[PDB]
Paper text:
HDGF (hepatoma-derived growth factor) and the HRPs (HDGF-related proteins) consist of a highly conserved PWWP domain in their N-terminus and a variable region in the C-terminus. HDGF2 binds H3K36me3, H3K79me3 and H4K20me3 weakly. To shed light on the molecular mechanism of methylated histone binding by PWWP domains, we determined the crystal structures of the PWWP domain of human BRPF1 in complex with H3K36me3 and that of human HDGF2 in complex with H3K79me3 and H4K20me3. We were also able to co-crystallize HDGF2 with both H3K79me3 and H4K20me3 peptides, which show very similar binding mode. In all these complex structures, the methyllysine binding aromatic residues are from the loop between the first and second β-strands, the N-terminus of the second β-strand and the C-terminus of the third β-strand. In these complex structures, the insertion motif is directly involved in histone binding, forming one side of the histone binding groove.
The PWWP domain comprises 100–130 amine acids and is often present in chromatin-associated proteins. Taken together, similar to other members in the ‘Royal family’, PWWP domain also exhibits methyllysine histone binding ability.
Author numbering:
A (entry chain B): 4 to 27, 35 to 93
B (entry chain A): 1 to 93
C (entry chain C): 5 to 26, 36 to 89
Write the structure that this text describes.
Amino acid sequence: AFKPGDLVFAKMKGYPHWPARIDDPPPNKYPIFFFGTHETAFLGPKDLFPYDKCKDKYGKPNKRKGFNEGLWEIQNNPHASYS
Amino acid sequence: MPHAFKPGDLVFAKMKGYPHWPARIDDIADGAVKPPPNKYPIFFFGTHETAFLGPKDLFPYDKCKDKYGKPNKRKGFNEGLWEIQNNPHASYS
Amino acid sequence: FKPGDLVFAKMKGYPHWPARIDPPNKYPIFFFGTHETAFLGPKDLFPYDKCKDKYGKPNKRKGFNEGLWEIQNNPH
């Protein structure tokens, strides 16, 4: 399963696969923290892609607000308090 | 003295082929598409459309309302006039 | 959508724009009139024959009306 601190790209409708982590929720959903925007959501595993596996496909800069900062955070300090 | 443009500033915005149009400097939601360098996201009242414009096309509302703040035949213009005067900071989406 | 398919393509800050099909689940888009290219997802794309009644109307934006002429008369 996914555990708190696992790094992912998380997919929501209308947005690119977004650098995120599992934070420490409805059944079979996880608390997601989105890097860059510092937003939260509850997502299921269908929308959760392991970071290391998928970073070559999903980890490329784009024009969305918060995305490029999100990429910096997941690479450089993924476990910090962003609150 | 004037500052640079910021989200929430009210303007008349000038697009080619259109009258100076009531508008605001929009905010950019988290996750949303950012403007190009030196451009602002402009939300046009009435039509509710967004374009990216530089300051050459942006006329401060308080200064220019006497000149441009007048009914126009164009689709959405008069609704735009109501919005800029009465609820310019509201959610229109 | 397939290479050559005619569409209206929507980018933030622009009207629905005559274009053709030429980064995960993005299509290469060629915009008529301006002759620029972008990558766009299927959500931003609208089949030309299906939606021309709606979006095939003149616009004062630079290159748009030239774009409309190309999509109807010389799309390839």
